[PDB]
Design a protein around this ligand. Sequence first.
Ligand SMILES: *[C@@H]1O[C@H](CO)[C@@H](O)[C@H](O)[C@H]1NC(C)=O
Ligand SMILES: *[C@@H]1O[C@H](CO)[C@@H](O)[C@H](O)[C@H]1NC(C)=O
Ligand SMILES: O=C(O)[C@@H](O)[C@@H]1O[C@@H](O)[C@H](O)[C@H]1O
Ligand SMILES: O=C(O)[C@H]1O[C@@H](O)[C@H](O)[C@@H](O)[C@H]1O
Ligand SMILES: [Cl-]
Length: 333
Amino acid sequence: CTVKSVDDAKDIAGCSAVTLNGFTVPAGNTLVLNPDKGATVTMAGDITFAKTTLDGPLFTIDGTGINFVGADHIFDGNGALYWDGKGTNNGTHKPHPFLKIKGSGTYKKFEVLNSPAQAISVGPTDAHLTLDGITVDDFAGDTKNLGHNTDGFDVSANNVTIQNCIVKNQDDCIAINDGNNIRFENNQCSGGHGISIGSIATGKHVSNVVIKGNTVTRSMYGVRIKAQRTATSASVSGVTYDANTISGIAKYGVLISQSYPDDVGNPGTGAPFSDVNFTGGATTIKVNNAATRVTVECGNCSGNWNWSQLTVTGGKAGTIKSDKAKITGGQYL
Ligand SMILES: *[C@@H]1O[C@H](CO)[C@@H](O)[C@H](O)[C@H]1NC(C)=O
Ligand SMILES: *[C@@H]1O[C@H](CO)[C@@H](O)[C@H](O)[C@H]1NC(C)=O
Ligand SMILES: O=C(O)[C@@H](O)[C@@H]1O[C@@H](O)[C@H](O)[C@H]1O
Ligand SMILES: O=C(O)[C@H]1O[C@@H](O)[C@H](O)[C@@H](O)[C@H]1O
Ligand SMILES: [Cl-]
């Protein structure tokens, strides 16, 4: 019931308490844990992943009701051995995602250090999944702008809570791409592209999202809802921004857009957005001198969007094209 190697991981059936020791995952291997239902997995050392040619995920854990106790240990993806300024758009192969977490349970207090590109993929789930106190430290990817597409959390799942986490990276802090009942609370995001829903693709539906109590600094966007212009049979509905504190934003404080990958222009109509609110505690956003405060670019949006608790300052005014939606309140124009 102690895992000291990739091969040991295959031998944990029957263990209600697994100890995950530190070791290196060699080139051409992956580390896969399928723990017993309700097991506790406790990390007791750091796991380093030698440079590899495999596609990710390089680490996969999948189980029901898992209690993962990280004890502040590290999954080290050796990302600087791959970073080349091009991320997953071109250039060197980047194993991605680095980690994949599936099923349900509670994951606490570990660090992903220097993912090659996207750090943690979440989902699907079979019950509630909570990630609590995880650090995605990709700060080294800021050097010479080599890290890219280093998303902290990419979520395609229902019934997820991500809280008390820290992400230092070069792309979305979180990207919520599909699922219902997702809560992102009391997290700290810096360096990257802010807190995102999307990009929304054909057939994907995000609903009942709560983005509460987070801090975003030194990022390209504060919050975004992005839908691919060409997406159809898709939607975002029921999003509440509450008590977020944001500053140091380079491009847009808020960008709600159905033009992705463009920020604006000929927005699509097949991924309707509804019921997007800034309520509860103040969401205050400070943007840089060349930035835009708020832009909404809807081809198809609906509902009474209560933005009363949003304040955005700095930079210049954006543009509001809200289609059928009526946006009330706030300070940002
Ligand atoms: C990848 O680079 C090739 C040539 O280098 C170019 O055709 C292509 O558009 C690039 N794709 C991305 C995402 O950059
Ligand atoms: C998981 O989400 C699905 C769809 O939203 C819902 O039917 C189910 O009740 C949720 N389960 C839990 C434990 O939250
Ligand atoms: O929203 C998007 O489609 C992008 O940001 C993608 O998300 C992530 O998978 C990568 O950063 C990029 O490929
Ligand atoms: O944030 C975004 O949507 C985009 O950021 C760009 O810098 C990155 O090259 C794209 O792949 C996408 O991640
Ligand atoms: Cl290899």
